[PDB]
Amino acid sequence: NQVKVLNLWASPFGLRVLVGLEEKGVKYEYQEENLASKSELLLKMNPIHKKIPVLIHNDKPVLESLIIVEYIDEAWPNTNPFMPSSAYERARARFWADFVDKKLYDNGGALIMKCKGEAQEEAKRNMLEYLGLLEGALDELSGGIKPYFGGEKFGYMDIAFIPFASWFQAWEVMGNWKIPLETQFPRLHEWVNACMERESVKKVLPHPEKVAEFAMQMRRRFV
């Protein structure tokens, strides 16, 4: 087949790509990579970053997950629109996906993984602040409409964010705490539960327990 995906099973960034592929109804090859022993294929396709995910479409590589998502939407444009119609809402969608990566993850969950003590508590403070902002972002982009970031339509932003729900338990485990979604962030809770009813998400999103084990394994490398 014309389409291949190189990924790490627990990576939210490639899970974006899989979810996106399924939503468009694309059949694809999947190759699991060991980042400790990377395929020459990955190095040939992503020599600059040497990172997953990689999407190979007709042996041409698409790199960096959000761009890949936009690529998928633009490469399979006849159905299932990820992007909004208006420019500004698209700008906001991009802004918020970017925000998910740079803040909720890079300046949140990653530090929960890597950090210890007051640093970790600070990471958790940050995570709550960001999830608050994202709870607000949901009502912003949805226009109050339920239950997705695209209201009734499951879109770019839903795709960018929902794989991190597979990481919540991991974050809870490594920070030894409880994330109060149901109470402090109910829209996101409902949204996750809603997203979990879709075929795509059920097909590709892994069990949180496994991710958590995996995350702990990775935490030991740090701390």
Ligand X SMILES: N[C@@H](CCC(=O)N[C@@H](CS)C(=O)NCC(=O)O)C(=O)O
The residues of the shown chain that bind a copy of itself, judged by CB under 8 A, are: 48, 57, 60, 62-64, 67-68, 70-71, 74-75, 87-88, 90-91, 94-95, 98-99, 103, 133
Of all residues in the chain, what percent are helix, strand and coil, respectively (each to 5)? 60, 10, 30
| CB closer to a copy of itself, 10 vs 141 | 141
The minimum distance between CB 154 and ligand X, in angstroms, equals 20
Q: How many Å apart are CA 176 and CA 163, to the nearest integer?
A: 21
Distance of CA 150 to the CA centre of its chain: 16
Q: 9-48: string of b/e by CB count within 10 Å (b at 16+)? A: bbbbbbbbbbbbbbbbebebeeeebeeeeeeeebeebbee
Residue 84 binds ligand X (CB under 6 A): no
| CB closer to ligand X, 103 vs 189 | 103
Query: Which of a copy of itself, ligand X, none does residue 177 bind to, with CB < 5 to 8 Å depending on kind?
Result: none
The minimum distance between CB 214 and ligand X, in angstroms, equals 10
The minimum distance between CB 7 and a copy of itself, in angstroms, equals 17
